[PDB]
Design a protein around this motif. Structure first.
Motif, short mmCIF file in Angstrom:
data_model
loop_
_atom_site.label_atom_id
_atom_site.label_comp_id
_atom_site.label_asym_id
_atom_site.label_seq_id
_atom_site.Cartn_x
_atom_site.Cartn_y
_atom_site.Cartn_z
N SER B 1 -78.78 68.56 -66.42
CA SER B 1 -77.60 69.28 -65.86
C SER B 1 -76.95 68.52 -64.70
N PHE B 2 -75.68 68.84 -64.40
CA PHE B 2 -74.96 68.20 -63.27
C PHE B 2 -75.53 68.69 -61.93
N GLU B 3 -75.45 67.86 -60.89
CA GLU B 3 -75.96 68.24 -59.54
C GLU B 3 -74.88 67.97 -58.49
#
Lengths: 50, 47
Positions: B1-3
């Motif tokens: 997932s994006f952070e």
């Protein structure tokens, strides 16, 4: 730690002072204080409980 | 997932004196001497 410094009503303990003593303490004494007063001056005194 | 990306670190800053530590007679190792510092800015680089 003194309750009075932060909340007197709460009774919670919050540090108010730091003492720089690094010596182990194995003994303590309590209530050595006395009152000098005339018979009329004398009143009931509150006490400290350990 | 994006952070998320870290940015704008917030640091909140009184310079405590270190003169007693460098001055006077140092006590022996059994008589170890320390100074407690709280809520004070420090200059370890100067020491």
């Amino acid at each position: 730690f003194s309750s009075r410094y932060v909340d007197l009503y709460g009774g919670n303990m919050f540090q108010f002072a730091t003492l720089p003593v690094y010596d182990t303490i194995k003994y303590y004494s309590i209530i050595p204080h006395s009152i000098r007063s005339i018979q009329s001056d004398r009143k009931a005194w509150a006490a400290f409980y350990v | 997932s994006f952070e998320a990306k870290p940015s704008g670190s917030v640091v909140e800053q009184v310079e405590c004196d270190f003169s007693p530590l460098l001055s006077g007679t140092p006590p022996q190792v059994y008589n170890f001497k320390r100074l407690v510092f709280t809520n004070c800015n420090y200059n370890l680089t100067k020491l």
